[PDB]
Ligand binder design. Structure first.
Ligand code: ADP
Ligand code: ADP
Lengths: 669, 791
DNA sequence: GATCCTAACTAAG
DNA sequence: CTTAGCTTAGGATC
């Protein structure tokens, strides 16, 4: 009725745009597949649709109403980015989070040009352009995925990350499954509850299953390499070892009562005929490269054994012929050797070399020993050389026939691998749950997070000092906590453990706290750290404000926002002013479950000034030169940073601290 | 106390040296334990591992090989972290407890900005000198202290300078010393035998005295000429004292030339090779790495991260960059064809080269004569040396051209890799094998006409050998002579005694040909191997040549100019630009003058946000680094005085664990600056006191700057949005205000990007946030609040 | 007195 | 790319 929309196509994917003239909501989508395009067009019900002249799939477009064939110049990549930036008055669209989306921006440029064509009126309604994601998974921007340190810390090391604490998974194919899960938080309650039940039920039988799962091996990538018919023999030997161990895994899982544990038990399968084939057709320990040979176990084919028996018959006949030739010639120095260049030979000392009979013919010649070829030996060596090659060639042919026999079940083996990988993450999540004293979360139907005896998993485990437990109550009635406290007080640790508890709750895992009440959460936003992209023309402040803009644009009521102290990298007064307005918009309008840690103590008045907002104070007491921190979240607002005290513990010289305290006396007066 | 015997010994040795990252020799591998591992891991980029637990949780361990120490040891000391190298002094045999370890050497940051390192009046300095083809080897022993120094100079100037610097009380020279003139001035001159300067006797004599098995820990094992001198000196120490002295327990390196010390934080804050995002793109290296040869790419990235202070080396690069500038376009194409000579030769060294790689070796030797000829025309002392050092290796050119096919397959097992006619035998057996393919067709014709079957086609299966495949229609028509071995739906495969005898010839010829090639492909490595030493020198020279022509091409392309060395603390830049930003951004970079000096030691760079405060601050260092890697700087004129340390502290991020807060790390790293900094050191600071409350941050900043000026006297650029510290210049001498400015014409703000004298009073934050993309609703309330806050 | 895991590279496919 | 090969000590438990 008022949803003027644009569509445009490129070879890789298609681009959709929607402008609400009435609302001023400007939205952007990039749906590559046709089903989503049809669904989104039906969902929107565009009042008028613009359609590129050069669009191939006319069928999708032809059904829609208010159809307009539009020129290609309106769908230009460059003209769109500048036209939108000019209207907004910005230099880049990185703040809106649409800069990276080209196809939608193309559509948006044509729509903005058609917005002028339709109205040409005042356009203050168009200040922003959002990108609506259809994942139905918690959407975490790459900035957050490194700020919370989910899998990668700020230094870039795999150590001191959430994944490190929760990745005791015994199979390397399960390590990848969990790291997939941590970055893709399933938002549907029904799936998380199945994992939660399975984690709780397997908790009894963790110790029994975890050892048997280790023996499976990296089955996922072995199947992928088998699919490309380039598995190599040590990999097929790992497939055999798994099929040996699957029956044990099935039996232990039979005892475990849960319906999904029974489904994974049945989905794992047996594949006993493949167990039989690999056991029959591969030697206990083959080499890693097939071209070398020694891969095919004796019993698989009769013909391999016949030619291998000729080759084995050659190696005994080598010693038997060496003994009979040594006795018949009467030469003790007579020794039989195989040089690849000159084939099999008879090497005698030069002293007895001329005494070797006429049948002996020098193929290889050295001064110290002479290497001869008897005609009987030559007939046998020709037999050895032709058998050696045929055996190697047959080995490769059978090693291909094995692929052909194993290939049909690959579909079910892939399902088996997915199930066994899933099981290892689940029994790993059951082990860490019991080992680290985690609990099961519950899902209330309304956005909010209620934590009792809440702990930051990484810090508490990797610091040899008791973590003081912190209670949290974020709800629709209490949407913001201004966490103001002394430096090293725990204001930023208390802030971050809210979102790591929230994330772990949403990949189906047990959580650090004693009790959790996690409501629905759509996105986890953070502004933490500091950096300057001088090469991409962004000062340290701009990058900070670009990420504050991402939050202020794309945050909803259902979103958890964890802003660190902001307004840093401008003058005192200017930073405080921007921080007050940022927090107000996050509370009075956005209504996001927010923790706003600030060393600025003027913002401690915001709960009195605004509704549905509260203050909390991680406190410390300054006894002597040293400062003692409580590490305890208590209600109220801390008035003092004790920065000059936290600098003395940092190692700043006493001379510098003394003058700074003398200056603080003057500054306060 | 309650730990394992070895970790007990580690902790009591670790207790002696509290902040010193201690290298502990656990058999083959030096490795750091507990916190020192986590210090080692994030600096040296070795993999952190958890070894078996000792009276608690597992021990975090981070290790290196014994012979790669000096490579890593350099990367540690150049980031400021002093290394405590701890050898196995005791025998690992007859040690039921841990092998006894003692801290033989403490390699400091190596700050040698002070002109009088060794005093001129310092006597009882018994010294030794010996010379070979490569250069001189000098040693100095102070017997009274037992303090030992070891130097191996490359040119006469350093030898004369070091002899003058030391002023040895007694000098032991050698029977064969060529440049007698340098040592003629030196007092207590003694002509000494060659056996006292034998390399083998020197290594055991030093090891025996210190009680070690190797000198790799002291970092002198690899250095032969100095060790020869040290052996004669140590032998003459026994001769003079007629005793062994425990004072002389160690041998350090006197010729440790101070690379400008840059902590790992700075090496990523300047983005020398790795930007803050971690990508190879938008780094200094990216701008200066258009080097055509992969062997050269790693050479300049090595150079960028070791900015050497020695003027002699920088001048050789400066001259060669200027001289080759004419023949950039001529040499750069010919250098590309050489290939990665570094990596091919490394494969030749392990005797495990692919034949495709030896074909790339041939291609280089083809192109080397052309390179020498072009370089002959360019007359310069180092360009002629690199021209001669490159070499020809014509006999290897001949061998590879004779013994490798124009384009060989990727493995030798593939076959045909060895060029026919290098050996008579290979072509004779290959000719027998080639005899098969015509014999195939000639019996496919003779059998087709004798049988009279037109559909008859002869084929070879690997499993069933050669066969006679005939359609089922003509399969029953095939004669009795034909014997069906292999049976298919559309065709029957027969066999003839002539095809069992011929196929045996084809399969024994095929194998013999393949076996001979492998043998020859090994004989080639034996013939090429002797010259590897000189080929390695050639590779080092060709790599060096390519960074120099790249730097020469980029110098002319980007209009860079030769820098000047005042040799008095100061920096004097006119028309300088940030190399990365102007190259990687469409808009012309506005050039900026800088005038640091002893009279003007501090500039409080206060300006609007994104005014160019941080680029002007880094631009100083990147110009300074490029000047000390002997490259042409981005400028019109530069007079860079001595710098021992570039400190950078722009922005902070917290681990949020293990006692780290945004504030904790900022104060700890300003602490590093406030203690380690010298009058020679360049300090760069952005708004220290960001991670703490308003009044506490200003107070700490005013004390930090005062100490940096009134005491440390460091060439400092103190960027601050705090405008209270703009008053510091009046209070203390040698501090001045500077203002990167911008003009607000309308709602939008234009940044001038020009360093002008004065102090800007206003930070245009709310305006630079609107251009960042913060919603207008947020900006409007923030401006309304700023009105209230200011009032 | 003995017995597992450990630390940089290499490079074939 | 890329997933497989790459080294002297330690330590206990009688
Ligand atoms: N709840 C807590 N219990 C115990 N220690 C804590 C707690 N919260 C933080 N810490 C400790 O505080 C230090 C980090 O403080 P941090 O919150 O980063 O300071 P700031 O709030 O000023 O940014 C670390 O030693 C960390 O272990
Ligand atoms: N001289 C110049 N000419 C053109 N662009 C410049 C110049 N100096 C800086 N810039 C650009 O403007 C930005 C300067 O911001 P910066 O100096 O980092 O500010 P801040 O000190 O607040 O961090 C950089 O991103 C750079 O791309």
């Amino acid at each position: 009725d008022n949803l003027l929309a644009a569509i445009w196509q490129d070879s890789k994917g298609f681009g959709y745009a929607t402008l609400d003239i009435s609302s001023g909501r400007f939205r952007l989508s990039e749906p590559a597949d046709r089903e989503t395009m049809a669904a989104e067009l039906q969902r929107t019900n565009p009042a008028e649709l613009l359609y590129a002249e050069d669009f191939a799939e006319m069928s999708l477009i032809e059904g829609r109403r208010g159809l307009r064939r539009r020129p290609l110049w309106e769908f230009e990549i460059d003209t769109a980015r500048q036209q939108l930036n000019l209207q907004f008055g910005t230099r880049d669209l990185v703040g809106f989070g649409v800069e990276n989306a080209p196809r939608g921006l193309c559509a948006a440029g044509c729509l903005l040009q058609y917005a002028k064509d339709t109205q040409r009126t005042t356009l203050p309604h168009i200040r922003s352009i959002t990108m609506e994601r259809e994942q139905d998974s918690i959407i975490m921007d790459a900035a957050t995925r490194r700020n919370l340190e989910i899998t990668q810390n700020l230094a870039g090391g795999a150590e001191n990350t959430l994944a490190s604490v929760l990745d005791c998974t015994v199979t390397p194919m399960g390590s990848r499954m969990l790291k997939r899960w941590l970055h893709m938080p399933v938002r549907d309650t029904r799936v998380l509850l199945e994992r939660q039940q399975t984690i709780g039920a397997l908790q009894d039988f963790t110790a029994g299953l975890q050892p048997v799962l280790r023996q499976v091996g990296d089955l996922e990538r072995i199947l992928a390499r088998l699919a490309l018919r380039t598995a190599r023999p040590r990999d097929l030997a790992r497939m055999r070892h798994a099929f040996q161990q699957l029956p044990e895994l099935r039996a232990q899982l039979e005892t475990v009562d849960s319906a999904p544990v029974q489904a994974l038990r049945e989905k794992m399968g047996e594949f006993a005929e493949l167990r039989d084939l690999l056991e029959r057709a591969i030697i206990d320990t083959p080499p890693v490269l097939v071209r070398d040979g020694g891969v095919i176990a004796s019993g698989y084919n009769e013909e391999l054994d016949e030619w291998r028996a000729l080759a084995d018959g050659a190696t005994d006949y080598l010693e038997r012929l060496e003994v009979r030739e040594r006795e018949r010639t009467g030469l003790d120095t007579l020794k039989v050797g195989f040089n690849a260049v000159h084939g099999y030979y008879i090497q005698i000392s030069r002293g007895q070399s001329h005494l070797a009979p006429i049948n002996y013919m020098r193929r290889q010649t050295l001064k110290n020993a002479e290497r001869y070829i008897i005609p009987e030996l030559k007939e046998y060596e020709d037999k050895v050389l032709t058998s050696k090659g045929k055996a190697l060639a047959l080995e490769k042919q059978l090693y291909e026939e094995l692929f052909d026999l194993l290939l049909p079940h690959l579909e079910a083996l892939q399902q088996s691998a997915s199930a066994l990988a899933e099981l290892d993450v689940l029994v790993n999540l059951a082990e860490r749950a019991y080992t680290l004293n985690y609990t099961c979360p519950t899902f209330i139907d309304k956005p909010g997070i209620r934590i009792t005896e809440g702990r930051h998993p990484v810090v508490e485990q990797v610091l040899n000092e008791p973590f003081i437990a912190n209670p949290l109550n974020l709800s629709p009635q209490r949407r913001m906590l201004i966490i103001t406290g002394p430096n090293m007080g725990g204001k930023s640790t208390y802030m971050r453990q809210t979102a790591l508890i929230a994330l772990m709750a949403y990949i189906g895992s047990y959580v650090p706290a004693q009790k959790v009440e996690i409501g629905p959460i759509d996105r986890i936003f953070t502004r933490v750290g500091a950096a300057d992209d001088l090469a991409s023309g962004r000062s340290t402040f701009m990058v900070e404000m670009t990420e504050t803009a991402n939050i202020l644009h794309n945050a909803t009521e259902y979103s958890l926002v964890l802003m660190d102290e902001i307004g840093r990298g401008t003058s005192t007064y200017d930073g405080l002013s921007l921080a007050w307005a940022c927090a107000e918009n996050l509370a009075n309008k956005i209504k996001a479950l927010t923790l706003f840690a600030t060393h600025y103590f003027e913002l401690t008045q915001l709960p009195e000034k605004m509704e549905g907002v509260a203050n909390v104070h991680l406190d410390a007491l300054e006894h002597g030169d040293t400062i003692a921190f409580m590490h305890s979240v208590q209600d109220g607002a801390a008035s003092k940073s004790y920065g000059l005290a936290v600098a003395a513990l940092a190692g700043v010289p006493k001379e510098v601290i003394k003058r700074a305290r003398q200056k603080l006396r003057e500054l306060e007066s």
